[PDB]
Model the fold of this input.
Amino acid sequence: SFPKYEPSRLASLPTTLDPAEYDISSETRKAQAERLAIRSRLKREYQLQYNDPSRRGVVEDPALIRWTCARSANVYPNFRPNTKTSLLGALFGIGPLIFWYYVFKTDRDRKEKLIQEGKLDRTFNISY
Amino acid sequence: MLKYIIPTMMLMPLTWLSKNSMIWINTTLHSLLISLTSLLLLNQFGDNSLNFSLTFFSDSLSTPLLILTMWLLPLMLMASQHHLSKENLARKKLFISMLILLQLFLIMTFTATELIFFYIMFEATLVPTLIIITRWGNQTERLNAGLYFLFYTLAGSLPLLVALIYIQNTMGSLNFLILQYWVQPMPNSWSNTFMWLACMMAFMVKMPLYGLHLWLPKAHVEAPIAGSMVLAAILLKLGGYGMMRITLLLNPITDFMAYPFIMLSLWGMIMTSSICLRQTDLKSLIAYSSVSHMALVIVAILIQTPWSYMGATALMIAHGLTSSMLFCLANSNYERVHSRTMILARGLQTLLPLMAAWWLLASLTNLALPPSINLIGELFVVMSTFSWSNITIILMGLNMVITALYSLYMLITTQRGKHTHHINNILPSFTRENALMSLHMLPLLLLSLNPKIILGPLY
Amino acid sequence: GKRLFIIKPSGFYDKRFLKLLRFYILLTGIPVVIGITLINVFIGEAELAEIPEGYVPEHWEYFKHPISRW
Amino acid sequence: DAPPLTLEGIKDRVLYVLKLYDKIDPEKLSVNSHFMKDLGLDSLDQVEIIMAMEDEFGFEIPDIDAEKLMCPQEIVDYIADKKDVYE
Amino acid sequence: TLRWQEDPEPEDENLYEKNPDSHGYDKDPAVDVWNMRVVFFFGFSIVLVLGSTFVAYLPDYRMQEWARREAERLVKYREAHGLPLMESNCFDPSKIQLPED
Amino acid sequence: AFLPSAAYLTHQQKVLQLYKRALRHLESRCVHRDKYRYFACLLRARFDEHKNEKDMVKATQLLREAEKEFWHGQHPQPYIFPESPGGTSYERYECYKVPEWCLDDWHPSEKAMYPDYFAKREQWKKLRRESWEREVKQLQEETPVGGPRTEALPPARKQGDLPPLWWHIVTRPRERP
Ligand SMILES: CCCCCCCCCCCCCCCCCC(=O)OC[C@H](COP(=O)([O-])OCC[N+](C)(C)C)OC(=O)CCCCCCCCCCCCCCCCC
Ligand SMILES: CCCCCCCCCCCCCCCCCC(=O)OC[C@H](COP(=O)([O-])OCC[N+](C)(C)C)OC(=O)CCCCCCCCCCCCCCCCC
Done:
């Protein structure tokens, strides 16, 4: 009949085709009302601190500094080395190094064994 | 070299005997006189270095670094003369004295004929930067920035000094005018392997090498900007001077040993370019870009071809100037907005047009726009690394995409878009700031016309 | 004629900085280029000649331009 | 290009579009004539009017503000505010 | 009950109100004017243009131009006597004691 | 669901928004005026034939089928107005929306170039700074406990008193500067 548009990582469901909009339980409107109350408090605080003629400076959002502190400074203190983290670190830390080392190594032996036997064409190669 | 050391040690009482409101003017004027005087070092010949005396010499290699150093001091003095207006006068003179002592130790570092003298003042340079970083910073982490910066570098070189002393017991002299003729080949053994490691790891830390680069971003996001410019622009070049003075003695064992160092440098410069692609602070982004540039310089001197040496010296000088002026940009932004977040202050081209022009010129010179000296050095290193092996160009090519991708993006979110509404303290351009920015930018363009003065010791 | 206003940031400081930069570079650039063309038009660039017998030259008598010799 | 419009110009335009609608009789309309009360149309006719005004002025009105303006005078006020008349 | 009694944190001092002609050096206008004149004279008018004039007329860097002239002689020799341009032996091959094989 | 004032979209509003979006996509599908008018009358007649349905759950399921066919039969590139988001000229002229406080940073030698405008600006700023304490007095007693429950700003209840929090909404420049 109609194509079912599947959810994807790069293609989220729309705000209109989601069945979660169209449920009529009471805690849905209670949660929406409390979210609106929180947003109204934050917007009221921003407008009172933002329309002030006396204030000349940056409105210091705690969320921005909180996110920038959580991005870098709060990685090690809540890190515990387990199987997953150590496995991922060993996979992404020494894997590509070994791969590039072996590729460049065998390229070096091939080039050297070509150039000692004179098979490599170096007729005009005088700048190195 | 007594005609530049004595001016520095005689300017030391001048900044100690100056008045309470004329310290900056007198120091800037006399440092600019020393900067003009320093041009006499270019009396260079195609065969012999300008050997001044027994313990002082300066070939075609160290002279651009010296000129950069005592041109860099007045720029640091202008860039650090705003926030120290409320600081006490005695501590202001202490800060200026620390900068003067750092310049003196740097000029004595690049012209030391004996390698022991070079080492001794190369980490006599460690005390003033540590003092400035720990005292005149602006965050708590500066205390941690005094540890990771110190206990890395010394841990690389306390072996190295022993190795240097061993050469004093082996060759009989560590002089560089002698060791160019008394050098013996290095055999393949474990003892020579550890001697190579000890002679390499100190400046590998000081570049920094990837894996050992953790001291660079932690010591840049908090420094006073005089410290940030001296660290990014000239203090990282001590590793390059260590390479081009030490690698003579470490042949031919360097050729079949430096494979993991080159692998680490290439894949770590890829990693740090990717980390620049996902940063939130200006200072950390510039520091990681500096890590990528020094990894490229590491590969350039490790492959040891003449074209690579030309490219390494040109890239070193150009990256020093570009990183110093980028840190000046970031300091102006942090001065105006009192934060280091990239996404906070956006769309400044609508409010500040000349800083937008300097941002554009900085971003253009960062991604090696021809015919700038950055492109000259980067291109020479590219061709030398293609001569080392073919597949390396692939490991270059992605980087040359990524080193553009952030270099404009770091501009764009800071300059283009809708400006932040709740920020209103954006002052217009102070003449001091733009004068500093132009003094950074104009030599970088001028050196493109006559590159032969900064093309290493073998041009 | 409904002449409206466009709000723009103050360009006086940027223009003043540019004027100061241009004036301070021209104040020495004009005498330098005037002196350069005067020595190139009156003092005269040197000429190539072989070394005479029994007469050594000075260390500054091996270059072409008079400014280089000075 | 794009000459500024006065309030009486957009007023003439909105009354013209109202007079060209078959559901509106061309005699009983006013600036404050409510669509459900003075004339007694439906919500669908209100969205029809909103689409007519969107196509006539060549710009998009958001759906919340489409349903909020409920008189021709509110339409005139919103258009005059968005185009910033009397410069 | 307030801990470690400290003065309130000072605001960002602005420079264009007490002096709209300030160039960002200090508060005294004479100090600002003298600092601006000193840097714009001894940084641009003194080091840039005179340094450019010095390095433009620098006396034959590394004898590079000389490297042409003698070479301009040398081929002029060996194109007139049938000699090869350059030889594969950098030094004299008759003045070397070859080791035994 | 996400609104400045409300927290829940009534089914009538959802039906109206579906009608608006579907008819806009229909207009973007058939370009010519006659075909658009004919199919628009057909869609209006369909919504009228399903207008007389007072069952909430039946209109719920009919809305779900309607949204499914609307997403199934929509144009890939719907027509977007040049000033609407997603348009060709969305936020293009925003590079000249310099805020008013940049006039604070002007040099005094240029502030005498337009004397009447700057005098009017300072008296407007005086009006705003004396009305600031009055409007924060207005919010400090009208707001319910625990902050406001909705983001709808109150009007000015007194003659002569300025509207509360009036400045930064009325201060935005013209769209063609
Ligand atoms: C940043 C932290 C890591 C830094 C790593 C630095 C490089 C790693 C290696 C450094 C070794 C120490 C210097 C050795 C210099 C040797 C010079 C030489 O000629 O040697 C030949 C000599 C050879 O012996 P010989 O010369 O006496 O013998 C005569 C010659 N033959 C052999 C023919 C008879 O080597 C040695 O004696 C041993 C060298 C290896 C030393 C191993 C112990 C040290 C291990 C590394 C410790 C590094 C610091 C760790 C802690 C850091 C802080 C937390
Ligand atoms: C040096 C290492 C440390 C770095 C920091 C240094 C700090 C101190 C700085 C001191 C001052 C600067 C010193 C270096 C100066 C370098 C410049 C210099 O003097 O070069 C000498 C060179 C000398 O030229 P030359 O080398 O060819 O001359 C040979 C020498 N003689 C004359 C004796 C035979 O000058 C030039 O090349 C100038 C050329 C003419 C001027 C330019 C004309 C064209 C301008 C652009 C037109 C438009 C083009 C299209 C544009 C399109 C859009 C982009």
